[PDB]
Amino acid sequence: SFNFPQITLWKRPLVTIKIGGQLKEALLDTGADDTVIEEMSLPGRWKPKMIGGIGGFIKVRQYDQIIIEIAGHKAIGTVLVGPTPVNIIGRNLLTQIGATLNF
């Protein structure tokens, strides 16, 4: 419905992100504490982490202080990389771009 993708949540709230100079599709996800992206190379050091969701847990690599643009908004923060079914923008970066849930 109302445009990015979409504001009233009748369609998935999908946006384009840019990370490591590549464009990807991601979901704005208020139910995600953390941002999680499919396998890709990121600079710097990382640390393993397991995170859980509906189905159980997956091991991810945690990269801190990564520059990522989200729907045109610049953010710099933690990105988890692993076998997620969807690229997810979680609250750690939603707060950086000033996203709010209103109702």
Add this chain to the structure above:
Amino acid sequence: PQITLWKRPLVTIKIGGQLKEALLDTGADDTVIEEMSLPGRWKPKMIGGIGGFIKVRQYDQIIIEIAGHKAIGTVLVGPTPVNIIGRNLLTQIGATLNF
């Protein structure tokens, strides 16, 4: 009205005569609640998240109260680690995501 996302967006819901805590989740297509009984008919469904699929019972035309707002829709019931209010019902309480 406006929920910041510095913490998890948790609300109280009333469903099937009980009160529960649930997460307002724009990343969820569907509402999924921990095991409970609901009246009427249901059919089995599989739903996938991070870390694979779980089997749930799909109940249609269930009335819920979310933070005070009544709504009706499908509710999936099964071994989810968190009660999640998905877009199918967020739309019914006029939730929007703004930035």
